[PDB]
């Protein structure tokens, strides 16, 4: 009992690739400009006398690097998964991307916890003490992101295959299955599950607490608080669900068919594009809304 599927040549999807290239360049320009302005405003504001919260500066830096290292992916993608650059460039580029992306994702959760504590606990602590605490946690999260990225970056080396070339990760022969699935799971549990759970719980508690206080409700709003979670979910869900679905396919839990392969490839690419849009939308949600920020920008 044998089967012989002769998969036909993939249709001329290059139009899809060109379309995705247009989206990436738009994100590149928008994200670079927006995040740079936030950093500039934040650093300047200190002279006036504002209390510029350190998480915002660190988060802006992380997103700036991510959106600044997109063009390499565009060059690779325009050639349909090929790679014309050197190996050292591949290692360095991936390392930068992973560190910054995980840094940004973790900083969202840290911001949520700090906000809830600020309205509840830190109210009486002196400014110096909370400033020191924020600096310490800022250092720690960078180190954790550094630790997360390293394992896969070290296991990276190109191949030649025909006459094309690729930059594909190499994993131990004796434990290929474990390493691949383990890498992609830590991408989820430490990338989507834990940050999303903490963020959702803490912002719901903030909504309850702010509702209880009579004075706070008038000036603030109860819609932006829920908007945070909704935007994060919509931007970061599709990519992870698609990748998890593909992982199940790799283990042969689903029948294989040409339509399936085409759909997964296009779906994976599209949902990754949305995951970058997250970085573009982050600054507008977290800074541009604040009235003080808008007025501070207006005076400069």
């Amino acid at each position: 009992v044998v089967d012989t599927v002769m998969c036909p040549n993939m249709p001329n999807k290059s139009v899809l690739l060109y379309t995705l290239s247009f989206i990436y360049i738009f994100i590149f320009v928008i994200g670079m400009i927006a995040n740079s302005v936030v950093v500039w405003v934040n650093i300047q504001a200190k002279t006036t006398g504002y209390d510029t919260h350190c998480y915002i500066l660190n988060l802006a830096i992380a997103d700036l690097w991510v959106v600044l290292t997109i063009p390499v992916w565009v060059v690779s993608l325009v050639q349909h998964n090929q790679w014309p650059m050197g190996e050292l460039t591949c290692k360095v580029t991936h390392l930068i991307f992973s560190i910054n992306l995980f840094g940004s994702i973790f900083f969202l959760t840290c911001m949520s916890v700090d906000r809830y504590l600020s309205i509840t606990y830190f109210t009486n602590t002196p400014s110096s003490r909370k400033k020191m605490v924020r600096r310490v946690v800022c250092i720690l999260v960078w180190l954790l992101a550094f630790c997360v990225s390293l394992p896969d970056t070290y296991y990276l080396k190109t191949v030649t295959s025909n006459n094309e070339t690729y930059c594909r990760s190499f994993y131990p022969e004796h434990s290929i299955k474990e390493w691949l699935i383990g890498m992609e799971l830590v991408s989820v549990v430490l990338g989507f599950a834990v940050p999303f759970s903490i963020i959702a719980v803490f912002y719901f508690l903030l909504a309850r607490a702010i509702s209880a206080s009579s004075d706070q409700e008038k000036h603030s709003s109860r819609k932006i608080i829920f908007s945070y979670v909704v935007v994060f979910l919509v931007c970061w869900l599709p990519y992870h669900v698609a990748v998890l679905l593909d992982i199940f396919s790799i283990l042969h839990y689903i029948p294989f068919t040409c339509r399936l392969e085409h759909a997964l490839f296009t779906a994976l690419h599209v949902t990754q594009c949305l995951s970058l849009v997250h970085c573009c939308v982050n600054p507008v949600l977290y800074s541009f809304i604040n009235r003080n920020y808008r007025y501070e920008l207006m005076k400069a």
Partner: antibody, heavy 127, light 108 residues
Framework: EVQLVESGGGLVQPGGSLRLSCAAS????????IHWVRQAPGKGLEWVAS????????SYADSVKGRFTISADTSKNTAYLQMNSLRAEDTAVYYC????????????????????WGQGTLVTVSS | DIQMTQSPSSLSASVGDRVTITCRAS??????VAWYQQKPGKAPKLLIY???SLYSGVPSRFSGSRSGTDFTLTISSLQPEDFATYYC?????????FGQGTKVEIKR
């Protein structure tokens, strides 16, 4: 609409105890802290203590470290200050002042200060 | 425990005259200052908080400025309604240490 009114006072024999009450109305107390500032006759002000009813975190001024137990009761959005071992150097008037912490400006807030003050009460310990 | 030296202790300026009061800090404080006014035998009010931002409600004559660790309060001109005492503050190192105090009396 924020109004703070103190209560409790009057002369007390040296080496006693006092329990001052600062009832806050018109705004929930959990968000903001509460501070007590002292003013001896014909002299500059000075800080004493501060309490956040949210989780009970407190602080004190070195001059009176250990002699005061500032207490909070979020149930009736009130602040309580208990005095002990009163000496003939605390003769002054006590104002209970709030230090609000807005939330619509979280990431770009300004170092806040005391906003709403009360008339205070007069404490005159004498023998 | 940060000493907040404040000078001059006393002043005397006629109506509608500029006047400036300087408050200093021995250490460095990250622009966390206030400036309270106190009429005789009354609850002190607030004029300027943060470092140079005015507080809603008070006239616009009062304003503040920062320079290293030597803050200063500026008055555009003294109406016959602001003859009282002003206390500076720092809120970046518990305990809070108020300044000595400034008295601005009428001149004749």
């Amino acid at each position: 609409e924020v109004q703070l009114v103190e209560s409790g006072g009057g002369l007390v024999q040296p080496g006693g105890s006092l329990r001052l009450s600062c009832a806050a109305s018109g705004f929930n107390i959990s968000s903001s802290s509460i501070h007590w500032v002292r003013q001896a006759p014909g002299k500059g002000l000075e800080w004493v203590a501060s309490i956040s009813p949210s989780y009970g975190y407190t602080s004190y001024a070195d001059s009176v470290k250990g002699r005061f137990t500032i207490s909070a009761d979020t149930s009736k959005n009130t602040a309580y200050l208990q005095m002990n071992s009163l000496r003939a150097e605390d003769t002054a008037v006590y104002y209970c002042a709030r230090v609000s912490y807005w939330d619509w400006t979280w990431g770009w807030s300004k170092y806040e200060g005391m906003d709403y003050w009360g008339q205070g009460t007069l404490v005159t310990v004498s023998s | 425990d940060i000493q907040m030296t404040q000078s001059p202790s006393s002043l005397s300026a006629s109506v509608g005259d500029r006047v400036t009061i300087t408050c200093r800090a021995s250490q460095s404080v990250s622009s966390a200052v206030a400036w309270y006014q106190q009429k005789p035998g009354k609850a002190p009010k607030l004029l300027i908080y943060s470092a140079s931002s005015l507080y809603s409600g008070v006239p616009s004559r009062f304003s503040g400025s920062r320079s290293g660790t030597d803050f200063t309060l500026t008055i555009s001109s003294l109406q016959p309604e602001d003859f009282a005492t002003y206390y500076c503050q720092q809120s970046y190192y518990y305990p809070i240490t108020f300044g000595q105090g400034t008295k601005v009396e009428i001149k004749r």
